[PDB]
C-alpha cells in the first residue's frame, strides 16, 4: 500500500523517488528539473 513511480521510458517502477530520479538521470538522461514528464506517480496496494 504505497505510491510508486515509474519511468515513462522503460516502464520501471520504484517504491521511492530516489531510485526513480537516479534512474531517470542515469539511463533516460533526464535531469531532476525535467523529471515531471518522464516519471508517473501511481498508488498500488
Ligand atoms: Zn527507465
Curated annotation (Swiss-Prot):
What keywords is this UniProt entry annotated with?
A: Metal-binding, Zinc, Zinc-finger
Q: Where are the zinc fingers (C2H2-type)?
A: 5-27
Cystine pairs annotated here are none
Q: Name one GO molecular function term.
A: zinc ion binding
The molecule here is called Putative zinc finger protein ORF59a
Species of origin: Acidianus filamentous virus 1 (isolate United States/Yellowstone) (AFV-1)
Amino acid at each position: 500500500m504505497e505510491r510508486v513511480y515509474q519511468c515513462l521510458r522503460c516502464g520501471l517502477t520504484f517504491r521511492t523517488k530516489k531510485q526513480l530520479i537516479r534512474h531517470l538521470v542515469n539511463t533516460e538522461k533526464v535531469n531532476p528539473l525535467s523529471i515531471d514528464y518522464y516519471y508517473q506517480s501511481f498508488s498500488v496496494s
